[PDB]
């Protein structure tokens, strides 16, 4: 099974920012599902531990100029 990161981000308190890095990281090959919070400013990205990595996800995310805290590997 893939591994879910949680990273908090701050900012992000619109559908546009999100929806913009849910695309670009749906991209990348290695992800297989991702949930880009706002509310509770905080990212879920779900990717397989072998095509991509946490560094490829928060250097990407980061990248727009998004902070983010990426500290949780509930994967299941
Ligand atoms: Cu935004």
């Given at each position: 099974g893939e591994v879910?990161?949680?990273?908090?981000v701050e900012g992000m308190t619109c559908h546009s920012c999100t929806s913009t890095?849910?695309?670009k990281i749906?991209?990348?090959?290695?992800?297989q599902?991702?949930?880009?919070?706002?509310?509770?400013?905080?990212?879920?990205?779900?990717?397989?531990?072998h095509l991509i990595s946490v560094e490829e996800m928060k250097k990407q995310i980061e990248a727009m100029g998004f902070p983010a805290f990426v500290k949780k590997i509930e994967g299941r």
């Open positions: 879910v990161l949680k990273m908090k890095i849910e695309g749906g991209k990348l090959q290695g992800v599902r991702i949930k880009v919070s706002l509310d509770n400013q905080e990212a879920t990205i779900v990717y397989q531990p």
